[PDB]
Amino acid sequence: LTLGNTTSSVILTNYMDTQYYGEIGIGTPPQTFKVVFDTGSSNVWVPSSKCSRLYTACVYHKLFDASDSSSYKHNGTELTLRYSTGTVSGFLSQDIITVGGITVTQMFGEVTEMPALPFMLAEFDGVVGMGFIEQAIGRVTPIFDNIISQGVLKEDVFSFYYNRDSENSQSLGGQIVLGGSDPQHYEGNFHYINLIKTGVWQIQMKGVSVGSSTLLCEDGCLALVDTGASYISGSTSSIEKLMEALGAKKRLFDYVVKCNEGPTLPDISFHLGGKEYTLTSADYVFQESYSSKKLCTLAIHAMDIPPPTGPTWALGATFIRKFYTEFDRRNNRIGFALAR
Ligand SMILES: CC(C)[C@H](C[C@H](O)[C@@H](N)CN1CC(=O)N(c2ccccc2Cl)CC1(C)C)C(=O)NCC(C)(C)C(N)=O
Numbered sequence: 163l164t165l166g167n168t169t170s171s172v173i174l175t176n177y178m179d180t181q182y183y184g185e186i187g188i189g190t191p192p193q194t195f196k197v198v199f200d201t202g203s204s205n206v207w208v209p210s211s212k213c214s215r216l217y218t219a220c221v222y223h224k225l226f227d228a229s230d231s232s233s234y235k236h237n238g239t240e241l242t243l244r245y246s247t248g249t250v251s252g253f254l255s256q257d258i259i260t261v262g263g264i265t266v267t268q269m270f271g272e273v274t275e276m277p278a279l280p281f282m283l284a285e286f287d288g289v290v291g292m293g294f295i296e297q298a299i300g301r302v303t304p305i306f307d308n309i310i311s312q313g314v315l316k317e318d319v320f321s322f323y324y325n326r327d328s329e330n331s332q333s334l335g336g337q338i339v340l341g342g343s344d345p346q347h348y349e350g351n352f353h354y355i356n357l358i359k360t361g362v363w364q365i366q367m368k369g370v371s372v373g374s375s376t377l378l379c380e381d382g383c384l385a386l387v388d389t390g391a392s393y394i395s396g397s398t399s400s401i402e403k404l405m406e407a408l409g410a411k412k413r414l415f416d417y418v419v420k421c422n423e424g425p426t427l428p429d430i431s432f433h434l435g436g437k438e439y440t441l442t443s444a445d446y447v448f449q450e451s452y453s454s455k456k457l458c459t460l461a462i463h464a465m466d467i468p469p470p471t472g473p474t475w476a477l478g479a480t481f482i483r484k485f486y487t488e489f490d491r492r493n494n495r496i497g498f499a500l501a502r
């Protein structure tokens with residue numbers, strides 16, 4: 163592990179507080195893509211030009227055309243990434259990728275199959291896994307791992323900043339610091355919690371409480387920080403409990419409450435690493451109205467991650483929006499500091 167004296171930031175655009183993506187360049191000349199940086203997975207893919215136009219998701223997204231890159235290097239091994247919400251498939255390809263000014267030779271997947279649901283709802287073109295190599299499908303080396311290998315980053319860590327406001331443009335949707343963290347988006351001190359098992363940004367969850375009582379997971383559970391997840395999530399069971407206390411009316415893909423009821427919803431604290439990270443209703447309730455005739459969805463819902471990783475709580479944007487997060491690959495730890 164060689165540490166340099168560099169840092170690199172990636173400006174992120176905030177889409178409806180559910181999607182945060184930056185741009186990256188691939189091939190020569192560079193072909194730009196909108197990608198979400200996902201600590202949940204570990205691979206890199208962008209929709210490929212060799213993707214049938216019968217997949218409408220490919221018709222609506224930028225497509226990488228290896229035939230246009232002079233730096234491209236063929237591989238072709240079949241690849242499939244099975245996320246808990248959708249799946250993509252294609253083949254491995256190598257080319258130069260430019261991220262935050264940094265340039266690195268990277269092996270990535272060219273997707274030739276992306277189902278309309280959920281990808282037609284994706285404002286980004288692809289993903290950049292920030293997970294560990296151990297979880298990389300096809301044993302493909304994670305982009306960050308390769309970067310670290312250049313011996314230029316200051317620390318074997320990267321931080322995430324997600325802005326609340328999604329509507330303003332003049333402001334920055336978010337920021338990722340490769341090689342450290344940015345003191346301008348957090349205040350106070352960082353409080354760490356080591357990873358449980360290596361190869362996964364997952365940690366011990368000593369309990370989730372909904373306001374008054376500690377009505378959830380008294381025996382403990384795990385929380386996986388997914389900077390590529392729109393919301394916070396618990397096992398279908400746990401959430402039926404958590405919502406019950408909120409009085410949310412469960413629907414097909416989420417829970418809602420009458421808009422008037424929104425403000426008077428109780429806080430929700432996650433006990434992590436010996437600290438209570440509490441959220442107020444305003445932090446997990448898409449207000450958007452105050453009428454009792456209207457419905458307002460919650461930035462929280464059920465999602466059961468299959469084993470070996472699951473079951474587990476997933477802390478996504480809804481959590482990172484309030485708590486600036488540092489990922490420490492050096493000490494298998496995750497720091498949480500109050501965003502600013
Ligand atoms: C384990 C789980 C937390 C993890 C979750 C996963 O990273 C997601 N955040 C990825 N995401 C799921 C999703 O629905 N995303 C999404 C968000 C809004 C609109 C459309 C989409 Cl497609 C974003 C992405 C980044 C595509 C997972 O399913 N990993 C796959 C696997 C387990 C195979 C792995 N590679 O480790």
Ligand SMILES: *[C@@H]1O[C@H](CO)[C@@H](O)[C@H](O)[C@H]1NC(C)=O
Pocket residue numbers: 236237238239254
């Ligand atoms: C793809 O890369 C892997 C890893 O180095 C290599 O073993 C494989 O042969 C490559 N694909 C081919 C056959 O070109």
